[PDB]
Structure formats: C-alpha cells, structure tokens
RNA sequence: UGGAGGACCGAACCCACGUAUGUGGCAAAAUACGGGGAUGACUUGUGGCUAGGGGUGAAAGGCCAACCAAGAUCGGAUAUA
RNA sequence: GGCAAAAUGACCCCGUAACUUCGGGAGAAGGGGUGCUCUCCUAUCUUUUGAUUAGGAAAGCGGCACAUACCAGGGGGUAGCGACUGUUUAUUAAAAACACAGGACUCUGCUAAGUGGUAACACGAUGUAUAGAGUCUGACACCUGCCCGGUGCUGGAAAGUCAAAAGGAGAAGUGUUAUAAGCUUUGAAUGGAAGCCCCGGUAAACGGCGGCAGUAACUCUAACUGUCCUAAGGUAGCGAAAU
C-alpha cells in the first residue's frame, strides 16, 4: 500500500517508486522537486542513512532516510506545455522586455558597437559573454567546479 | 442565446506624423489644419526608491532640474597651456 | 515625390474579387435610396378618453439640389523591409531601429546558480530543473550543408616542468691559532599544487568555406579526369538585390 499524496520518511519507502517534494536536511521542509508535474525516482535503500535518488536534472544525490517525500508526481502536467501567444501574457506574469547584446552601444555590454550587426572578432573574440565578462556557452562554471567536484567525489 | 478580443470606427485622454506659421516668436520647443492608439505592453493623481564611473534604459550613447562619451556646487587651485 | 490642396464620408438596402494561417481580406471593390404632404396597416401606447411618434407600403407635391448648413473613409493593382498592437534619439531622425510570443544552446541539486557590497546581508524566492540566469534568432510554413586547423570554453592521462615554504653541504668573513671553537654571510643536491607540454571534446560557441590543366562527331564549354593546396573547400535556395 503505497498511496498517492501520502508522505513518510524514506526509511518506510520502497525502491523504484516515484516521489516529489523531498527535503534535503532531516525535517527542514520540502525544498527538492516541486514544480508542476516533475518526478524524482529512488534507486535503492542501503541502511546507512543515505538513499540514492535520481532527480529531474538527470543527476543523482543521497538524502538521509529520516527525510520525507510525497508519493506520486506533482499536479498540473500541462503548464510545461501551454504556449502563450502575445506579449501581454509575459507582462501579466511579471516579466519586462529583455534587451539583447548586439543592440547596446559598446559602453554598456561586452557585445556592443558595430556599424550594423556584429559582436566580436575572428581571432580576438572570445565567445558570447554575460554583462560581466563571464562566458555562458561551452560548459562554463567559473571555479564553482570546486564545489561540484567535491560534492560529487563524496561518492 | 451568449459576449471574447494585446478586435474595429470614433470624442475624453495621451502621444507627436505631415504641411504652413512663427525663427529677440505667443512661447529658450508653441499655434492652425489634418494624424495614430483609444479595455490595454493603457492614461493619470498622490506619496516613497534607485545618485555620478553611479543610477535608470522595449537600447537612441538616451535621461538624471531647460546644454550628459560621466550631473551640480564647494574645495586642491591663482591647476596647467 | 500628387508634399499640399481637392475629393470621398452618414444611415438603409443591393451586391462583393484575388488570396488564406479558413480567423479573415471586407466599410472589399461596384451601385441604388434618403425631403415633405394624406392614407393604411402594422406596433404601441396608457403619457385615460383613441390618438399621438416610427417603419414600411403607395399616391402626390416643390426645389437644380432633399445625410441640403455642421458633422463626416479616396480607392484599386503590385514589389522591399518588418510578421502585426506596441517602444525609442524630451527640444531636427519614430523607421527597415528595439521589443515581441516562438526556438536552441549553455549554467544551477538549493546556503541554487547568477548580482550589488569589503562584509554582514539582501535580491534569486516565503521559488526548487515544466524552475531561475545568460546568450543568439525573432509569428507561420519549408528548412536548415561542410570545417574544431585559429580564438575562446572544456574533459583528461602518467611524463617532465614546476614559484614559495621545506635546505644537503660546500665555500667565505672574524676568532688563540693563521685560521680549531663559535657567530655570521652566501649557498644549495632533494621538495614543489595549479599551470605549461599532450591527447581529446565544442560551430542555433567567436569564426572560416580555393586555384590550375587538358577533354565530345559545330566552336563552345566539359558530363570525364589529372592535378596543387586546406582544417573545410559554399548544399538547398536566391540573385545586377537596402548587397
């Protein structure tokens, strides 16, 4: 009897199930997967406090057994599918119009300038860069690779 | 039967497209006649916030007290030339 | 440069094309009618008494003229750019500029990434990958070729190469002594993470995408091949174009 909407610690949870609304620290409060209809999935139960979970990001983590979850995927699966159809919809949600790089005068974004469209060089030009010299394509992480690799190689 | 629309025509309203006027003018940016949208990414009143290598920008090097590729005013300072 | 000026305009009726995303084009275009008088019937109307006001029949009646003044769309055919409504250089540029929903890539497992500050801390967000940030393009349809050699971004192997801290052992100054003790100066074999070096990965990352020389019963050109070079040698498509 694993029934939908119910919660419990993972210690009373069986392998292969589907879950959402996990909490990272023991009882802190559900901060893991929460969005409209997105489902994690457990992978095993070694009785060492930890439980290996596969998250929607594809990657996986270990959560203490005394932590909790909610059976079944979150509600409302379509929201990730509904395509808006004008500008007013964004505006209502809260957005404002976002301006690109190659538009701004060079004084304002590293991609500026040009007499007509252009951004960077054929030798010099580094890549496409954020407003603060940080590059955004290629797999860039900016020395948070330290944190990533530490928490990974804890496996 | 219903009454949706970043729907339509058109005053309030805002905005500022063309011509002519004016060019110590009525006015240090207006007027006449025509123009565009006109339930929406709307217009507005009130009061609060962001302050100069900074703000803010549906991005023009635009705007920040009538003159911004770095405000105003004091001071270094009778700067230098 | 038909700029301006002119003209069309209203209501009712007739009828209305290409095209298509089948919602629209569309007030498409193109026409007619519009006054008042009495009568008839119709409705309607309690504002009581039966008539009055409007509509639509049908007969007059006058004017050149009957939305008579004021008010009030010029329309059609076809390219380019942009999908459009929007926004912008207050106070010479409102556009093809910007945005825009739509698309892809990259980053983030939550003390989330990213941002402001020194720093607490705040935003992110009383949000949790169908989420948030950045980047390029810009509805829709058809589609999106080749190159990772360069710049960047990135994974990774042991090798050497390592800066500093760790520092052998020499040498040297001075000390009876002519050079032991001792202090001191310099040293200086090993030490050394990243990175450098190397091998990879990336083009909806920044970027680049060629020459020659012969060759057919008309020349031509070359379907054919020989060729030099690259990392790769411009595919679909388009084309004296905003080029």
Curated annotation (Swiss-Prot):
* Keyword Acetylation carried by entry: no
- Keyword Transmembrane helix present in the record's keywords: the answer is no
Write out the biased-composition intervals (Basic and acidic residues).
Answer: 108-118
Similarity section: Belongs to the universal ribosomal protein uL2 family.
From the record, give the transmembrane residue ranges: none
Q: Gene encoding this polypeptide?
A: RPL2-C
Q: Which GO terms describe its cellular component?
A: mitochondrion; ribonucleoprotein complex; ribosome
Compositional bias of type Low complexity: which residue ranges? 119-130
What other remark does the UniProt record contain for this protein? Answer: In Arabidopsis the N-terminal part of this protein is encoded by a mitochondrially-encoded gene (AtMg00560), while the C-terminal part is nuclearly encoded (this entry).
How does the annotation summarize its subunit structure? Component of the mitochondrial ribosome large subunit.
Report the GO molecular function annotations: structural constituent of ribosome
Q: Which domain of life is it from?
A: Eukaryota
Any single biological process term in GO: translation
- Give the species this sequence originates from: Arabidopsis thaliana (Mouse-ear cress)
Write out the annotated subcellular location: Mitochondrion
Shown portion of the whole protein? Answer: 56 to 210 of 214
Q: What is this protein called?
A: Large ribosomal subunit protein uL2my, C-terminal part
Q: Where is this region: Disordered?
A: 102-155
Keywords carried by this UniProt record? Mitochondrion, Ribonucleoprotein, Ribosomal protein, Transit peptide
